[PDB]
Amino acid sequence: GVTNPLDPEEFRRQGHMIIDFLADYYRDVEKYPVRSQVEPGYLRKRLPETAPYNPESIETILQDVTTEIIPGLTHWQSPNYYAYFPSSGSVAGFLGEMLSTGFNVVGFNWMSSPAATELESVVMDWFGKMLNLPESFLFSGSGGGVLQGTSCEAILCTLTAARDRKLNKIGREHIGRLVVYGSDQTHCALQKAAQVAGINPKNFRAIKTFKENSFGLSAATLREVILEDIEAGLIPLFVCPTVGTTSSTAVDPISPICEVAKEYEMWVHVDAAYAGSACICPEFRHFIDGVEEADSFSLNAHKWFFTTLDCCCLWVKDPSALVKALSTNPEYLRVVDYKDWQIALSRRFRSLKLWMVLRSYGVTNLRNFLRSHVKMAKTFEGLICMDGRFEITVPRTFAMVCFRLLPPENLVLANKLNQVYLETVNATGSVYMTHAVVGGVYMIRFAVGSTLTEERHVIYAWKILQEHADLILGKFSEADFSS
Amino acid sequence: GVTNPLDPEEFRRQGHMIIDFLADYYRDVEKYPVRSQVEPGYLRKRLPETAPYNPESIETILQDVTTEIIPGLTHWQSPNYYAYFPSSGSVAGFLGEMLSTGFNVVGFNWMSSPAATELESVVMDWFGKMLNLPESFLFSGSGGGVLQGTSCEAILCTLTAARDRKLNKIGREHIGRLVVYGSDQTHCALQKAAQVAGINPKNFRAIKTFKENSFGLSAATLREVILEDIEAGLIPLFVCPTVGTTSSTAVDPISPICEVAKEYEMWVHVDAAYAGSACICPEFRHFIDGVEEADSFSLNAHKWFFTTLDCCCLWVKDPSALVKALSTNPEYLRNKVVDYKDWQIALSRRFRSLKLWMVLRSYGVTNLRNFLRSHVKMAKTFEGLICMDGRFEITVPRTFAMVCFRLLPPENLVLANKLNQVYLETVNATGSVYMTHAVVGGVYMIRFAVGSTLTEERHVIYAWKILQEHADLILGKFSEADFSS
């Protein structure tokens, strides 16, 4: 009569069906245009306006996924996807999420599933030791790590913990004097966290960075701004140095910044959402030097660690600061209770993803995975440098190369040349790159991180960039870009 | 040579293994004790202290899942799980997450995956119309809906939107005077949202409720507290009436609450995290009457709508109020294609619309209505068995598929509370069933929440049998001195 929506045999049959559907997708993803070519509003036209009253077959639904959903996808998993930062995935990460979705437990507390809490603390110590984090960040020592969804939520929680730590000493009425510090390259997640956490919009600082420092935040500039804020009656609270900025993969020097922060009793959060995973490699560990003097450190394992979206790894020195700000149990009372470390109460079993990746691939293969991305980007950088019509705009640090086509007021023309040039390349659907404007310079970003990407795809992307460079420069007139 | 971590054939091979592993789990879940019986710290001692340098096989990991992970699980998917609220799942919803994790796109904006944005707006209109929400909550009309992870996140976003709307008019310096209003039964997600949003802790209100009103918030009591706050120089900002409270599934009357809230220009968010999905059935739609006068409305589709953890559904009359607070564009550009990241906290959004789309299509409105109805019937059946046993008592009216009850002794309250605490823990310790409790109005009561998808009538009857046999056991050897401590 009525089949249970979780019937084991129907789960088995349809599950095998979708596995085959997805394996075919990874096999054929290259045939699709990378950036979706549908028009806004395409899907509402093709779909009914109301839910169906009677059930539809999984066979019919899967066909609609092929005809209606897949065209409206920008294929982050395409090997020719080089936009933004990678949606780094893997078989192991996918299986860990499906085991998490299969068990479907709610990690509201330890008792709700003890493994969903204890496995998280183990793998965060695993990951932290591979990162060579100090014992002050590990359960092994005096710290701790927590898995979250995104970096914005992680930054939000460390910010409220920093806010509550200061306001509980000086009074809640001073919230309108707290200043949050970033660079003009810091990701929009910091400003959003400050807006949600009640920081005054006029008290967010995006400190100017300079080409002479490759747009990394100078501690000398940070101290100048703090003294200005202190003279204006404000209270410096929070600074967020970034390793691997999203625009140009700039790197803020953590140790000089923390030195300035301790003088003014400021919380330091190190944002390494993308590049942090590379410090698993000994030759890249120097990029987070000085993290031992910071209060919190975060990276997105879904960006450059194969887990699949989403898995944010947050290490803190003082988890009590998170609990004091995020727990709802009375202030006096304020086993691990992870819900008091983050926003989400109905936590997902995210540690399975990280556990699967670490076990299925091991430290050695994971290092070489990240190294292969960096090496393919180093090759792309070498190909650019051998073509005198191009220019590397900032030093490459982690697997992303920023470059621009040069023209054969001059900056505005060059910027327009690269916007048109990039746009014709993306319009082919053969590859996908995004851009950034750093120091007034419109530059193209080539971020090699898609798991399916091999050297032949990077070389193929170089061929298309060269062919389109031949096209635009061959018929170049500066009046065509002087508008 | 090393194989690509996303190799299609290896994905196919290992994927089929997990599907078989999970199907075996659903087939055999009844054999495990529902509440995990491990000791704290068991896992750290069975697992290595460092990550392995060399790869391990999926067959080895899977065996470790069986011997190390599964024992440390409390099986929310067990048909004998009646604790808290359900972790409502289904085949269709699991497959939606599978396709979402398989495509693994990032819904940062419309261009990053147009389908990941447009499908969400379609299905939210689908669900909203199934809930008979007014057009002011739909994209067809004046409003819109957004999919988030959890209701606390959804309440936080809605609260900061209400905060910014007020503070943009009167000035940011008045944040220390804003007051957030809830009942003493309101879920702690509201208080957590107020703590994050910068609301002063002494300006959070947990207004007292009374057994005479089944612990629903009285609009007259709410108006009394507001006048006290106004007379004390405070600014009432935000009230969150609940349909289906967590402890006793109480329901707050929405219409008179917004009437009070309209008088003092307050934002109203209707929290229906658990019970909200039931109102797609016309005979339960009356429970959210008055939502036409609220500003926002939320339910957890992972709680009672089969998606899977997690899927929170938030409808708002004015999405621009969310954009004004959550956008990082400068304030003059927010002051004017959907960009869902500005409706919520998450920037790197997940393709959550697949889950909801899959559930709605694979089962349809009629079958989905009957799924929820069957849970209510089974709970009403459980309620009937309780009344026929004179040793038990129903403590609050049953509203949506959760029954509150307690064992009665042969103050009396302290002894009765201690009796039910011992009684409940002895039942949960068997591992045959799992139910949690709540102290409402000074009364310790046991909660029986029928929502796990695999739960059938035989499981509810089985749980009633377990409760009766323990009742016979506790009361057969009853002595007042055994509980008067």
UniProtKB/Swiss-Prot annotation, chain A:
Gene Ontology MF terms in the entry: 5-hydroxy-L-tryptophan decarboxylase activity; L-dopa decarboxylase activity; pyridoxal phosphate binding; tyrosine decarboxylase activity
Obligatory cofactor(s): pyridoxal 5'-phosphate
Entry keyword annotation includes Lyase: yes
Top EC group: lyase
Any one biological process term the GO annotation gives: amino acid metabolic process
InterPro entries: Aromatic_deC (IPR010977), PyrdxlP-dep_de-COase (IPR002129), PyrdxlP-dep_Trfase (IPR015424), PyrdxlP-dep_Trfase_major (IPR015421), PyrdxlP-dep_Trfase_small (IPR015422), Pyridoxal-P_BS (IPR021115)
UniProt keyword terms in alphabetical order: Decarboxylase, Lyase, Pyridoxal phosphate
A Pfam family assignment: Pyridoxal_deC
Modified residues (N6-(pyridoxal phosphate)lysine): 303
Expressed in which tissues: Predominantly expressed in the roots and stems, while a lower level expression is seen in the sepals and carpels of fully expanded flowers.
Lyase listed as a keyword: yes
Catalytic activity from the UniProt record: L-tyrosine + H(+) = tyramine + CO2; L-dopa + H(+) = dopamine + CO2; 5-hydroxy-L-tryptophan + H(+) = serotonin + CO2
Listed PROSITE patterns: DDC_GAD_HDC_YDC
Coiled coil: none
Any single GO CC term annotated in Swiss-Prot or TrEMBL for this entry: cytoplasm
This enzyme's EC code(s): 4.1.1.28, 4.1.1.25
Gene3D superfamilies documented for this protein: Aspartate Aminotransferase, domain 1, dopa decarboxylase, N-terminal domain, Type I PLP-dependent aspartate aminotransferase-like (Major domain)
Cysteines joined through disulfide linkages: none
Family: Belongs to the group II decarboxylase family.
Subunit relationships: Homodimer.
Described function: Marginally higher substrate specificity for L-DOPA over L-tyrosine.
PANTHER family tied to this protein: GROUP II PYRIDOXAL-5-PHOSPHATE DECARBOXYLASE (PTHR11999), TYROSINE DECARBOXYLASE (PTHR11999:SF96)
Name of the protein this chain belongs to: Tyrosine/DOPA decarboxylase 2
Organism lineage: Eukaryota, Viridiplantae, Streptophyta, Embryophyta, Tracheophyta
